[PDB]
Amino acid sequence: QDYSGFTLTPSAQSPRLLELTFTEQTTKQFLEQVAEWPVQALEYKSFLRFRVAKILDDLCANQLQPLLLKTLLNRAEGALLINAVGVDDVKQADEMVKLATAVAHLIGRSNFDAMSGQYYARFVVKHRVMELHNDGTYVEEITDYVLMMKIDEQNMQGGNSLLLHLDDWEHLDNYFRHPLARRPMRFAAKDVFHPVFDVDQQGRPVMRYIDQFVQPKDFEEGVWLSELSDAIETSKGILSVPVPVGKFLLINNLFWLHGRDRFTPHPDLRRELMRQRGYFAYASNHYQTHQ
Amino acid sequence: QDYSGFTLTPSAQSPRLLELTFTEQTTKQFLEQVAEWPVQALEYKSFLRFRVAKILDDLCANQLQPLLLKTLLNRAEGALLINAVGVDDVKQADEMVKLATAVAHLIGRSNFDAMSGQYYARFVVKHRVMELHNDGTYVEEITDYVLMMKIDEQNMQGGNSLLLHLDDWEHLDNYFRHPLARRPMRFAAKDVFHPVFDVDQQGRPVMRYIDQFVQPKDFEEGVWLSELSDAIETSKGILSVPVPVGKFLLINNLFWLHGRDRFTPHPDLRRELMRQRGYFAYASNHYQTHQ
Amino acid sequence: QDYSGFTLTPSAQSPRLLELTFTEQTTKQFLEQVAEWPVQALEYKSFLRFRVAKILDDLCANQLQPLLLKTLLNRAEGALLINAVGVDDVKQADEMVKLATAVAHLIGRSNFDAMSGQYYARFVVKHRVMELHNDGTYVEEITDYVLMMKIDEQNMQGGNSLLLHLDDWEHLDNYFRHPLARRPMRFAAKDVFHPVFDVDQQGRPVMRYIDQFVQPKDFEEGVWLSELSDAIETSKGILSVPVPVGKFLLINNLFWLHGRDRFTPHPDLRRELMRQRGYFAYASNHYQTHQ
Amino acid sequence: QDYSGFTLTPSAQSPRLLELTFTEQTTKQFLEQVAEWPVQALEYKSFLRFRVAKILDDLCANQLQPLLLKTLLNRAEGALLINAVGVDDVKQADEMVKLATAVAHLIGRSNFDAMSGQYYARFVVKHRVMELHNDGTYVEEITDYVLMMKIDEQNMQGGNSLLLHLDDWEHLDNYFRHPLARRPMRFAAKDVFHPVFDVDQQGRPVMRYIDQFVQPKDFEEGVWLSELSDAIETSKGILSVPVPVGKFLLINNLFWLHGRDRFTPHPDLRRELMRQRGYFAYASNHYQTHQ
Ligand SMILES: [Fe+2]
Ligand SMILES: [Fe+2]
Ligand SMILES: [Fe+2]
Ligand SMILES: [Fe+2]
């Protein structure tokens, strides 16, 4: 469908993943209107992250924020691949960070990243599969969304993003109905305790799982987790999504798992990534008390 | 007016800011009587900060302490620019620290400074505006006063201190009456939570704001804070105050905001500053219990 | 006796210490079936420690896990010396870690080791007695088992493992019946407080003692502990057990103490050790509440 | 008077300070009987500190421990200068540490020293007065005794130990009767709060004061503390005690203050000191509950 300032079309891999592309005029107007705040200003004054968010939504006639929220909160969808025409070179890295910052802070706020000391983190890669998982399993607070942007890609074969929607996972019911699905388990980076499965407000399964940080306490927990891991990694429902330079995935971390495919080692290989993670925060008509 | 040991006259920028100058005999007597305690002694034994305070007040016939307190606690004023005749060269830095220490510890106590590990901190600058703000917004305890002294100034164009009294701010009522003025917000350097506005004992607005450390939790808080920031930075009520070498501002941090103007970059530029921050502490006739 | 996949025979030093040796086919099948997970995978994903445990037990027709548990929990025994035919060279260090990991995680889970940052630790030695003690005396949680493997041994004379079963200690009753046996004492690596003696579920003495970390608070506690130390170190019941390359002791840390004999200094000496420590965790028919 | 294994005589400076000297046979027997434990063994196994204490007391026919306790707990005395004939050279430093350790752990236990990471600390000096004070004012637990030993002394003029017994302080009543004597004040190295004065079990004044770590909160506390400091430092009751190599003071830290006199700077100057601090711990006939 055609919106004001951007277009929206389903991905080739799945109708659950929608591709959102900002038009060229929108992209140029946005970058002009945020030129006076470099990324270092966004790092130092967090309210500027919401200022650039409002500027982008205003340029889309205030159609962007409700669309982002409706897509990410919809159980049938919950995932976007987002880009802006004209921003597609490593040479535009700062502008990429601004764009992703503006989109993310229309639907919530990105959390402190311990690897960078900032609200976002950039990594340079210079080859085995990274297993499907959820982010933020080792703290008490829930991470609602994961944002992963491709900043550079050079002599790279493979390395697609892997995604798994729980309602595409053919083994969901077998593991969700197991008593250990509800057993609170230790997660360690202070340790936290929570089950591997939970439910959304409608009672549908959600997941908070990663094989590296879950700490089975005994032979019962450990064997079940090793079978769970195999059942996830071999699922027929996994998507393999290329993320070209300038595009970023933005997914609901509660019923999407994500990972990374193998890639070929190459002497002239360079991949650069940017990530942000946060919680949803939005207005809705709902009950309160007092005045 | 003419006091014992010093003179007092309103500043050129505002009747709220009073200039206090210690006479030459007072300055020389004070420095003689505190010569046996170097600044390093003041750093190691905090009671010596109150000893030098008493010596200065005694030399002013005990007229200094009540005058400082009356000025700083008066809502109509609350700010002083202070100097002593004959102390005006970088070469006298230690004597400047002694003088500011004595004045500050007549009205309270200066807190530990994490940048220096001492009760005061000195910084050397070797050019964009520093936005108006209050100090101490990221801890639970209230910072009542801010002290900023000019220790050296060399090939410096611009860089005046900026000040804003809340009762000179033409947008005060518009933002103080907004519901978000009372919303406790996160501040981070353990995080603390407090609103951007509060009230003094008479119900008049006070502020605890800085754009770098406030952490809006969502799009509502963030957009409002970005508008608040603009309304402060563009206020017609801002003062631009030069602070020559040997002078220091001492302001009530609850209804004065402070910042720093732009200055010209220059290869031979050198500016040195000293700061202290603390809480008020003073005698008054008021109620207590027991015996 | 002859089991499926391994043999079991009493040690030459004591009927309480049983020697368990995995046959050559079992050893080769196990190493083949765990080849796809290097030790670094076991370090990163703790459930793989239980996966390799199940593979080893399955190869022993599920006779290994009940035998290990019965031996370690039996007050009359409680100690094993374990090896696998064909694994006996420093050159096979990784395979040794896999084997010990699989055995340990059939009976419990190995705890984080602060010296290595992993669930196991390897040390290289390149000569006085190490006194008998229990592990884990300076934390609140109980360490149920100690695992010590010989990874390398080169020009080494002496250095046998020393072991003492409390029911072989001729002075047990004299010290267990002393009032200070029940006095909670300070242990320091946050400090913890617990007595030097306790009881098992049947009221038989157990010990949580080490001379380096216990901190007697006064002359009464200190003199008694110095006599206790002498009564332990001179006991006639101490075993001197050689541990050849590829063998590991696995002992119940509650009623076995362990140490190390003196060895000869030698310029070409090299000894490498691996340790793990953990708690028991196993299924049994016992009571619970609710559903 | 003549005891078994040592002699006791009042000092030249004060009848409150008793000089205790171990005879030559006692010193030689003690060092022989503790030869198998080097100081590093005392550092690692704290019960050995009580073992060497018992050996020394046994060599004195068990007359040492009751004498030490009676002297240190007696309000009229409370201070000892202790040495052993034949130990008086830097070359005997280890033996000095053993001797002081044995004496201290007959009357209590020495606490962890943050400057050395051990139960004792050695310092090398290579010249202004160190003001009179009590140790341990910045933690909650009470330090009952201070031990300071002279390990080396080379080209040293001055630098006597200074001591002040509260009942020799001519200004005690003037300050003890001031309301601020009972005001809990902040002490900082987590901060602790306690008054500068307290009382012993008989209601007689004791002190917990040091000028460097007390943190007066305002002009009232600070001026009083500066006058208190002057009243202490100028007291006629201060003792000036030389401490030759091999001697150590052992004083009751509750009603003795201690410091150090000025000394002459000299290019070939070397002074080495050892300190321990701890709490009293001893048997007495007193009430308890239960069985
Ligand atoms: Fe991730
Ligand atoms: Fe400031
Ligand atoms: Fe051990
Ligand atoms: Fe001291």
Author numbering:
A (entry chain A), B (entry chain A), C (entry chain A), D (entry chain A): 16 to 141, 154 to 216, 224 to 325
Study text:
We purified CsiD and demonstrated by NMR and LC-MS that it indeed hydroxylates GA to 2-hydroxyglutarate, while the co-substrate αKG is converted to succinate (SA) (and CO2), as is common for this enzyme class.
These two non-crystallographic copies are identical (RMSD = 0.082 Å). The iron ion is bound to the active site of CsiD by residues His160, Asp162, and His292 and three solvent molecules that complete an octahedral coordination sphere. In ligand-bound structures, one or more solvent molecules become replaced by interacting oxygen atoms from the ligands.
